[PDB]
Write a protein that holds these residues in place. Structure first.
Motif, PDB file in Angstrom:
ATOM      1  N   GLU A   5       0.730  -1.131   0.024  1.00 23.00           N
ATOM      2  CA  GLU A   5       0.043   0.067  -0.017  1.00 23.00           C
ATOM      3  C   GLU A   5       0.647   1.436   0.031  1.00 23.00           C
ATOM      4  OE1 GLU A   5      -3.283   1.271  -0.238  1.00 23.00           O
ATOM      5  OE2 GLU A   5      -3.999  -1.026  -0.408  1.00 23.00           O
TER       6      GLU A   5
ATOM      7  N   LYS B  66       0.577   2.622  -3.667  1.00 20.05           N
ATOM      8  CA  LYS B  66      -0.665   3.194  -4.286  1.00 20.05           C
ATOM      9  C   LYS B  66      -1.101   4.612  -3.810  1.00 20.05           C
ATOM     10  CE  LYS B  66      -5.547   1.552  -3.911  1.00 20.05           C
ATOM     11  NZ  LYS B  66      -6.467   2.864  -4.008  1.00 20.05           N
TER      12      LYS B  66
ATOM     13  N   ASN C 267      -3.504   5.486  -2.045  1.00 20.38           N
ATOM     14  CA  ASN C 267      -4.881   5.972  -2.046  1.00 20.38           C
ATOM     15  C   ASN C 267      -5.631   5.092  -1.212  1.00 20.38           C
ATOM     16  OD1 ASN C 267      -3.989   5.929  -5.707  1.00 20.38           O
ATOM     17  ND2 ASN C 267      -4.146   7.551  -4.303  1.00 20.38           N
ATOM     18  N   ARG C 268      -6.757   5.277  -0.883  1.00 19.68           N
ATOM     19  CA  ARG C 268      -7.581   4.334  -0.071  1.00 19.68           C
ATOM     20  C   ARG C 268      -7.774   3.065  -0.769  1.00 19.68           C
ATOM     21  NH1 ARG C 268     -13.317   2.097   1.076  1.00 19.68           N
ATOM     22  NH2 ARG C 268     -13.547   2.435   3.370  1.00 19.68           N
ATOM     23  N   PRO C 269      -7.588   1.809  -0.319  1.00 19.70           N
ATOM     24  CA  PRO C 269      -7.866   0.601  -0.914  1.00 19.70           C
ATOM     25  C   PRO C 269      -9.308   0.283  -1.672  1.00 19.70           C
ATOM     26  CG  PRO C 269      -6.501   0.354   1.090  1.00 19.70           C
ATOM     27  CD  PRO C 269      -7.377   1.595   1.089  1.00 19.70           C
ATOM     28  N   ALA C 270     -10.208   1.355  -1.401  1.00 17.24           N
ATOM     29  CA  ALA C 270     -11.453   1.262  -1.697  1.00 17.24           C
ATOM     30  C   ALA C 270     -12.096   0.010  -1.050  1.00 17.24           C
ATOM     31  CB  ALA C 270     -11.702   1.252  -3.352  1.00 17.24           C
ATOM     32  N   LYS C 271     -11.602  -0.386   0.075  1.00 16.31           N
ATOM     33  CA  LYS C 271     -12.364  -1.566   0.496  1.00 16.31           C
ATOM     34  C   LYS C 271     -13.918  -1.765   0.808  1.00 16.31           C
ATOM     35  CE  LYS C 271      -8.258  -3.182   2.909  1.00 16.31           C
ATOM     36  NZ  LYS C 271      -6.920  -2.530   2.495  1.00 16.31           N
ATOM     37  N   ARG C 272     -14.466  -0.554   1.302  1.00 19.50           N
ATOM     38  CA  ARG C 272     -15.784  -0.467   1.586  1.00 19.50           C
ATOM     39  C   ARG C 272     -16.508   0.470   1.124  1.00 19.50           C
ATOM     40  NH1 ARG C 272     -19.367  -2.080   1.197  1.00 19.50           N
ATOM     41  NH2 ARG C 272     -20.545  -2.041   3.046  1.00 19.50           N
ATOM     42  N   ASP C 273     -16.019   1.450   0.284  1.00 18.64           N
ATOM     43  CA  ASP C 273     -16.745   2.663  -0.247  1.00 18.64           C
ATOM     44  C   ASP C 273     -17.753   2.317  -0.990  1.00 18.64           C
ATOM     45  OD1 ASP C 273     -14.926   1.326  -2.066  1.00 18.64           O
ATOM     46  OD2 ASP C 273     -14.309   3.427  -2.976  1.00 18.64           O
TER      47      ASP C 273
END
Length: 100
Positions: free
Chosen positions: A5, A8, A10-16
RNA sequence: AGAGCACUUUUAUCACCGUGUCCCCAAUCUGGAUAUUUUGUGUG
């Protein structure tokens, strides 16, 4: 993920989650209908198999509408107004939703 | 932003084939709506 990470940045977009939606319900009850089904054997001589037999079966259908809540939320979806407009147009142009 | 709710109920199929509700029968037999009755009364 993302070489652990740091690359990246950036936010991993795990739960957006955007465009939360509910599940549709019918408006009329079910009265145990039935439509026949034949399915004959594919061939009596083909190299391709024939399921060894032919059997007749049943189905059930009904005529009913489907009410549906939308539940669109989020004031942060302003980065791409074009995407939102295209999504709304696609919803207005809904067709073949269930892969029946 | 709720013990992080996605990734799948999916793809094809004739209840088909032949079949005269058919064959006889009467609503038949009799019966006087009959008995009496002034449109009368006068005018240049």
């Amino acid at each position: 993920n993302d070489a652990k990470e740091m690359k990246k940045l950036n936010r991993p977009a795990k739960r957006d989650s955007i465009f939360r939606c509910n599940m549709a319900v019918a408006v009329n009850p079910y009265k145990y209908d039935t439509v026949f089904y034949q399915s004959p054997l594919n061939a009596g001589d083909s190299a391709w198999k024939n399921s060894t037999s032919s059997a007749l079966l049943h189905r059930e259908v009904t005529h009913t509408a489907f009410q549906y809540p939308f539940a669109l939320a989020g004031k942060d979806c302003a980065a791409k107004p074009e995407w939102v407009k295209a999504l709304l147009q696609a919803i207005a142009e809904l067709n073949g939703v269930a892969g029946g």
